[PDB]
Amino acid sequence: IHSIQGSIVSPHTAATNGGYSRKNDGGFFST
């Protein structure tokens, strides 16, 4: 279940990208 290394869940729905992270302050950053 947890002993898996394939990805890390973003705490928010990146579909909306609620935690808007910018491309080092330059654009989009989720996936």
């Binding site: 928010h12 729905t13 609620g18 935690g19 808007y20």
Partner: protein, 427 residues
């Protein structure tokens, strides 16, 4: 990103905040519990300016409500959106200040500032880069004024690089109910003029007037008044949260408004208000919209600047619109009364354009003026203060609290400074 944290001071602020917030939420289409129902992609994008996020699609907001009487806030909790409001933010006192601005200002606050500062610094570090924050209360609000003074005083040196909105409703000139209100008003404003940058002037009597004019529904609620003013504040905030051809920055708006540090006070003005037949008796055209906008009857914030003069004007329009109409309409008014403005700087206008319409109507606007329309108000406060301090009535309580009349002396000197500066700048 850049964000704002909301502040809810004084018992008026308590209700006005719940109203404003349900206005925001109903604009944003979330159910009261918080499980939103996707309709609006744009606000879906831009929600993070004003809400934070939880698990399972819940949009936890960012504000602090402060007061002393638990019943008011439990009534708020029983209000339609207590489930959206946070016990984390439910900070309060176990008593009352007796509406004694000084009791709050030195005694009661001394032990609640701790918790409120903890909460606000938690919020500040949780967020990354505020534009700043806004405050909602009454200048005549005893607890509101007392707490607001201290909190603004602290937060200035805390973060001196941020925006500090003050929405404070002005008590009725005709009746004050609370008669120590002139005391509290001058006391607060003495430090307010030093501290704040943007202040809103709002008057219950003028709200009653508009009720008689277009609302016309005989029996309104202070809640409906809250509806109106919350609509105004929503209008002034939407520019940040929305697309549209306009620089939304309230700092840019402020620097538009300020050649001078001492111009702190501002008179909001909203856009269409309607009767029950004029929905279908009114044709939505920008010309009549703006003609309605600039009206002494439309003037609701402080009073008619008719006897005064128009210093600076900033009009924002909301909904789809074209540049041509706004340009020509400003030329129209510029030339209709070029005399009625001030020659110091021509073209005292800045206009803003949000393309996104409101919900329930298509074309709307807001307008904020800083004109010569507060001389009446502070000259009134002057006569009241002078008459009071000929004999110093009710002052023994404030002595027992431990202050002195000398504070009142510098306050009245400060407001005389305000008198002279306003008058000398206008004439």
């Amino acid at each position: 990103m850049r964000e704002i944290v909301h502040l809810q001071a004084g018992q008026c602020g308590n209700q006005i905040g719940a109203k404003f917030w349900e206005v925001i939420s109903d604009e944003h289409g979330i159910d009261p519990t918080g499980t939103y129902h996707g309709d609006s992609d744009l606000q879906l994008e831009r929600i993070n300016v004003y809400y934070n996020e939880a698990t399972g699609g819940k949009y936890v907001p960012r504000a602090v409500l402060v007061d002393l009487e638990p019943g008011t806030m439990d009534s708020v909790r029983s209000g339609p959106f207590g489930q959206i409001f946070r016990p984390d933010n439910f900070v309060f006192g176990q008593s009352g200040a007796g509406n004694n601005w000084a009791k709050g200002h030195y005694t009661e606050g001394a032990e609640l500032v701790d918790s409120v500062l903890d909460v606000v610094r938690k919020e500040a570090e949780s967020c990354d880069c505020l534009q700043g924050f806004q405050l909602t209360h009454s200048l005549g609000g005893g607890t509101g004024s007392g707490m607001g003074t201290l909190l603004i005083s602290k937060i200035r040196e805390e973060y001196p690089d941020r925006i500090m909105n003050t929405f404070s409703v002005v008590p009725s000139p005709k009746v004050s109910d609370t008669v120590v209100e002139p005391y509290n008003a001058t006391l607060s404003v003495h430090q307010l003029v030093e501290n704040t940058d943007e202040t809103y002037c709002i008057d219950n009597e003028a709200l009653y007037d508009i009720c008689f004019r277009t609302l016309k529904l005989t029996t309104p609620t202070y809640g409906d008044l809250n509806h109106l003013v919350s609509a105004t504040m929503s209008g002034v905030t939407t520019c940040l949260r929305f697309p549209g051809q306009l620089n939304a920055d309230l700092r840019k708006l402020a620097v538009n408004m300020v050649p001078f540090p001492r111009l702190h006070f501002f008179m909001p003005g909203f856009a269409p208000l309607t009767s029950r037949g004029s929905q279908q008796y009114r044709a939505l055209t920008v010309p009549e919209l703006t003609q309605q906008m600039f009206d002494a009857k439309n003037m609701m914030a402080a009073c008619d600047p008719r006897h005064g003069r128009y210093l600076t004007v900033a009009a924002v329009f909301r909904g789809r619109m074209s540049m041509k109409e706004v340009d020509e309409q400003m030329l129209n008014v510029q030339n209709k009364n070029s005399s009625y403005f001030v020659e110091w700087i021509p073209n005292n206008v800045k206009t803003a354009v949000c393309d996104i319409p409101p919900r329930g109507l298509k074309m709307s606007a807001t307008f904020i003026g800083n004109s010569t329309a507060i001389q009446e108000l502070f000259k009134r406060i002057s006569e009241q203060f002078t008459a009071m301090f000929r004999r110093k009535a009710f002052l023994h309580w404030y002595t027992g609290e431990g202050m002195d009349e000398m504070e009142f002396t510098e306050a009245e000197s400060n407001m005389n400074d305000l008198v002279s500066e306003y008058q000398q700048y206008q004439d």
